[PDB]
Design a protein around this ligand. Structure first.
Ligand SMILES: [Ca+2]
Lengths: 238, 268, 258, 35, 238, 238, 35, 35
């Protein structure tokens, strides 16, 4: 006979994220095989690990072409005891906006793990020089001086045969996960700053272009993870 | 090979251009059991009805158009003696039984020449009313002789002209637009058939088993199989060649079962 | 390749028969008869009874007859006219005139793929209301049976006998639907998609089968005759073929080139 | 089978869910044979 | 006691194609056996494989009988370097309209596999001649010349003792399935053309009819398959 | 937790013939045993097999008592080459109306199997005579002549020591089941006629009553079966 | 059995779903015997 | 798996609940290889 049941208060509810299936309406359909297709992606982290270019406003001297954002930093010849460039370790910051790590990460609420900054020297091969890359966890005031940067996490990069240098921003946080978007500024959504200082000015022989450029890439480190899918920002269509 | 002689009782039909016998649905359409719907011992085959009966069809001429046809209802043709098809003891037995179940072996004969051209589609068609006029009455021997061949038309292709019950004055007479007994001339080859092509043979053979909506059927009204002869390619030849080649056919009832013996059928 | 179509048998070949290549692997079995006809389709739209009815009389019906038209639905893919079996299928191009417009039905889909002579299956019936918030019930009697007319009086209210009986009666909830499956119940073994016989020895219509159906359904309001309304209500009848089987290859309807 | 994806359970007995013939006690075959 | 349940959002829905049964209302019914009935059909492909006649508009010279469509092609005596007849390999084309393959196929969305064209010579036995049947996959322009047809898939048919010739149209497609109906013309719904050329004119002895006819049939090849049942076109009743 | 469910389109429906139970409202009730009661009936066929009297309109010469229907047939002395009595093998015919076979059968749509007619001679024991009972399947015209009856299924009954004769009407039908009610006359609801002819006139000695009567009974044969319960005809109460 | 197609399960015990006699502790037979 | 927490039962057969390719018969790998 009939099985007695007691439907719950949420009967007939439509839950967009319900972890279950619904009834098939047109089954017994066989599809063309996809074994011939290479390049299958299993997890978006596979793409977040691919380094992509960052973006910086071209030093107050833009090109007649509107929206003058560049993927590199030109190394000025004049000495100055402050960073050549610096940006916060806040994933929602515009410098990461168009990198895959940043774009993908903006679609989740949290991240855990290391971010990786990769630099590629694009000046002439005859050039020589050294740079000091540093990462400073939050402080009341952002460090500017070489003396200050040198007291944080840093590495000195030497220009030579090999063109690039990878710099892993350690995951130093009070919480096991951090906010992907700095809706409100806090120690959970803003984790300090990365900065690049020229250690010893670039040296060039005669008849060599000046101001060599350094390309910047960002990507997820090997232990980088994203959690909690969130609603997307549809503005890219406006 | 191409030369065969088929014997049945005191009958034998020969052909020297056989294409083989087209057997419908099963390898031996002759195997059949008594009807499960009758508890009386049936009358089964006896030698006087285990034979070929031969009759005539109207001649094929240059004027017959593509898709025009002639139909032979079975066992109807035996009952009306269409084409001179007198079923001897078979008809006598048929007229004395309420029910009859059987299959058929048929051969259509039509010899042409190596100088003639044209092709006839010969098929055994299940459940048709091609032997009836739209008014509901069966075509008489005279009507068949006057028309010779029935022309394919919108009515036949549509089933629009099949027999029907008039509704009465109470109803607005509707526009009849279609009928399930239509004939799609292009698909007649879906049925058990052979093609009598002037250039390849002078005969065709088809062998079909019993079929019906029930285990057995009323002798006087059933028409599960109809022999259909339809023009696919018009007949043609040069002056001097024999004109209007004739067409004949032979039919043999197979594994018959008769039930419900009674006095001869008398129309009410 | 060399052949002789006159034989009545032509083998299906492939690319490698005369050319160079291979066979294409099978993509589906959707042409499977059982799978193909196992889906619901609209059969007819009928009016809802609000009192005991008078079943339509047999043909030819003469003017002046008193009966209920457009209420009974014969369960069959075959053409029907005024709740009865038919041969020709008709409609009204000119709905203007005098006389009752006979209801007609046809399973359009079935015949577009019915390339066979006989068919059989069980029948799943679904009745859907074409009216807002309707409370109705469905009645059904077997092939070869008939509608039980008249009524009985309870507390001075007339209650049609179609409220009772031994056959299925399905009362839907308000705004609900009705659904159930019926077995092949005709006395015939199979249903003739096309037929060449006659059901009587005298004054019979050739090609008109007598019981090629799964019975007849009708809909009614679970209310006594007295509480009758004036606005005619309609209900849609859907059918689905279960465990369908087919026999003896035949033709598909002719498609005009005009 | 037909258009049925229910592998699991059958609540009603076969003789009720379906009709069955009373007793009187892949590979697609051709519908025609040339002999 | 009562089993707690949570009816889903689609409760009470009536799905016309639901792959399941409904409740029995009049069970325990035994039916008359159907073992006596031969000719059972299991799959409609069994019928699509049976060749049936194609249809062509009779060369601008119809018969006084309206709707002059013929199942054959008469072979003209005059030489002309273009096809005697040709039609697209588009299943919804009128030439297949009344063939079983076409009629059945029009009731599904896709097909995969070979189509088979069968030709039967119906001229006199004393006749001789040769034909070139060819299939051309899509091209910007439809081939017309013998020289063009000869570069595609083709076979030369010789008239003689045996009356017929089967021609399998290979299944050459970018996709594993093709559209059955060319609602929109594309490489997925139109697959080129089949054409018939007279290779060497027909030769006849004196006192022989002229213009012999060739019957055309179409059917599904052995690897032909149909997928996705679609709504029928009910117009055959109007 | 809660089991997800998907109630179907026919939820809440009340089906009068649903093959299932409903909830018990007042259980745990023990009833008085019925072992003491003999005569239990398992199937109504057990009653349909019991022969009961048929009914005929008394030959145009009724008794002053209205509704003059009799269970017998008086054998007239005058010779006449036509049946003494005859009736169709149509279960809805009035001659079976009040027999149990007919009454029970009228409540189902179909029947299969044999019907049995039993005759009992109720004339004097000194009487002698012979009768010819025959059954004719459908024909365009109903047989009347002894010569016609004799060509159908028949048996010759001799009057003597034993008083009765059973005649089984064979089940001769195109369909495995037949209609119980002849709503529309067809070969599926009307199966011919049964008729009784006097073969050799009844012979009696002097001082013997004339016109002996023959009682008629009808019942289900051993292979008789009924299928599909239908609505009853309530008119017996009006 | 009766008009019941439920082969599967019985939620309520037999003594609740049905009534049963208290204790005092195919083949159709004829209803009449000639002796 | 996907966003599915149903470990228990599957009422509809795999070929109905999902589509499957017809036959023609943790560890995240790189999408690029330097050779
Ligand atoms: Ca529930």
């Amino acid at each position: 006979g009939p099985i007695p049941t007691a439907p719950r208060e949420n009967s007939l509810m439509f839950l967009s994220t319900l972890p279950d299936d619904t009834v098939p309406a047109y089954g017994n359909v066989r599809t063309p095989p996809v074994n011939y297709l290479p390049g299958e992606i299993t997890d978006l982290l596979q793409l977040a690990r691919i380094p992509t270019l960052m973006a910086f406003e071209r030093v107050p001297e833009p090109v007649p072409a509107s929206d003058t954002y560049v993927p590199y930093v030109a190394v000025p010849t004049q000495f100055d005891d402050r960073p050549l460039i610096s940006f916060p370790i806040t994933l929602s910051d515009p410098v990461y906006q168009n990198t895959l790590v940043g774009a993908i990460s903006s679609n989740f609420a949290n991240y855990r793990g290391c971010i990786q900054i990769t630099l590629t020297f694009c000046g002439p091969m005859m050039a020589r020089g050294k740079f000091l890359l540093s990462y400073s966890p939050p402080n009341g005031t952002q460090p500017q001086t070489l003396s200050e940067a040198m007291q944080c996490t840093y590495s000195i990069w030497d220009i030579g045969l090999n063109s690039s240098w990878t710099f892993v921003v350690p995951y130093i946080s009070p919480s096991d996960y951090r906010e992907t978007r700095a809706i409100t500024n806090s120690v959970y959504s803003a984790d300090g700053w990365f900065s690049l200082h020229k250690l010893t000015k670039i040296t060039l022989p005669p008849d060599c272009p000046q101001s060599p450029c350094i390309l910047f890439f960002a990507s997820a480190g090997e232990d980088y993870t994203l959690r909690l899918p969130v609603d997307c920002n549809p503005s890219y269509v406006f | 090979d191409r030369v065969t002689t088929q014997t049945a009782g005191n009958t034998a039909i020969n052909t020297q251009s056989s294409l083989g016998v087209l057997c419908a649905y099963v390898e031996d359409p002759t195997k059949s059991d008594p009807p499960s719907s009758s508890t009386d011992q049936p009358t089964t085959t006896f030698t006087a009805i285990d034979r070929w009966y031969t009759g005539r069809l109207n001649s094929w001429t240059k004027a017959v158009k593509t898709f025009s046809f002639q139909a032979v209802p079975l066992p109807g043709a035996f009952l009306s003696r269409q084409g001179g098809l007198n079923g001897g003891a078979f008809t006598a037995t048929l007229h004395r039984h309420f029910l009859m179940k059987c299959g058929w072996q048929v051969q259509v004969q039509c010899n042409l020449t190596q100088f003639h051209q044209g092709a006839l589609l010969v098929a055994m068609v299940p459940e048709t009313t091609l032997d009836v006029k739209p008014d509901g009455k069966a075509k008489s021997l005279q009507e068949l002789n006057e028309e010779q061949w029935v022309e394919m038309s919108d009515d036949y292709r549509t089933g629009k002209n099949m027999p029907f019950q008039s509704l009465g004055t109470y109803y607005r007479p509707p526009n009849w637009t279609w009928g399930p007994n239509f004939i799609n001339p292009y698909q007649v080859t879906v049925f058990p058939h052979q093609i009598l092509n002037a250039r390849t043979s002078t005969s065709v053979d088809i062998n079909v088993p019993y079929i019906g909506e029930t285990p057995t059927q009323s002798s006087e009204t059933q028409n599960s199989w109809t022999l259909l002869v339809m023009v696919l390619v018009p007949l043609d030849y040069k002056e001097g060649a024999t004109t209007d080649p004739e067409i004949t056919f032979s039919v043999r009832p197979t594994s018959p079962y008769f039930n419900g013996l009674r006095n001869r059928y008398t129309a009410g | 390749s060399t052949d002789n179509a006159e034989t009545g048998v032509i083998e299906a070949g492939n690319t490698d028969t005369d050319f160079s290549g291979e066979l294409a692997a099978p993509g589906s079995n959707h042409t499977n008869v059982k799978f193909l006809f196992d889906r619901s389709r609209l059969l007819n739209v009928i009016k809802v009874l609000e009192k005991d009815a008078v079943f339509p009389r047999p043909f030819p019906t003469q003017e002046g007859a008193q009966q209920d038209d457009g209420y009974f639905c014969l369960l069959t893919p075959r053409p029907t006219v005024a709740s009865r079996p038919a041969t020709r299928f008709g409609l009204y191009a000119n709905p203007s005139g005098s006389g009752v417009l006979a209801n007609t039905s046809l399973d359009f889909n079935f015949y577009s793929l019915a390339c066979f002579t006989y068919f059989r299956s069980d029948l799943e019936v679904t009745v859907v209301s074409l009216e807002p918030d309707l409370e109705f019930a469905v009645g059904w009697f077997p092939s070869g049976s008939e509608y039980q007319a008249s009524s009985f009086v309870y507390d001075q209210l007339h209650v049609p006998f179609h409220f009772t009986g031994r056959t299925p009666r399905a009362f839907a909830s308000k705004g609900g639907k009705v659904s159930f499956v019926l077995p092949w119940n005709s006395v015939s073994s199979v249903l003739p998609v096309r037929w060449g016989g006659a059901s009587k020895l005298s004054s019979a219509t050739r090609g008109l089968p007598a019981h090629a159906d799964w019975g007849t359904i009708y809909a009614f309001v679970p209310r006594p005759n007295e509480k009758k309304s004036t606005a005619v209500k309609h209900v849609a009848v859907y059918i689905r073929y279960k465990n369908a089987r087919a026999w003896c290859p035949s033709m598909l309807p002719f498609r005009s080139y005009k | 089978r037909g258009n049925n994806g229910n592998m699991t359970f059958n609540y009603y007995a076969n003789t009720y869910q379906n009709s069955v013939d009373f007793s009187t006690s892949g590979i697609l075959n051709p519908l025609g044979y040339l002999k």
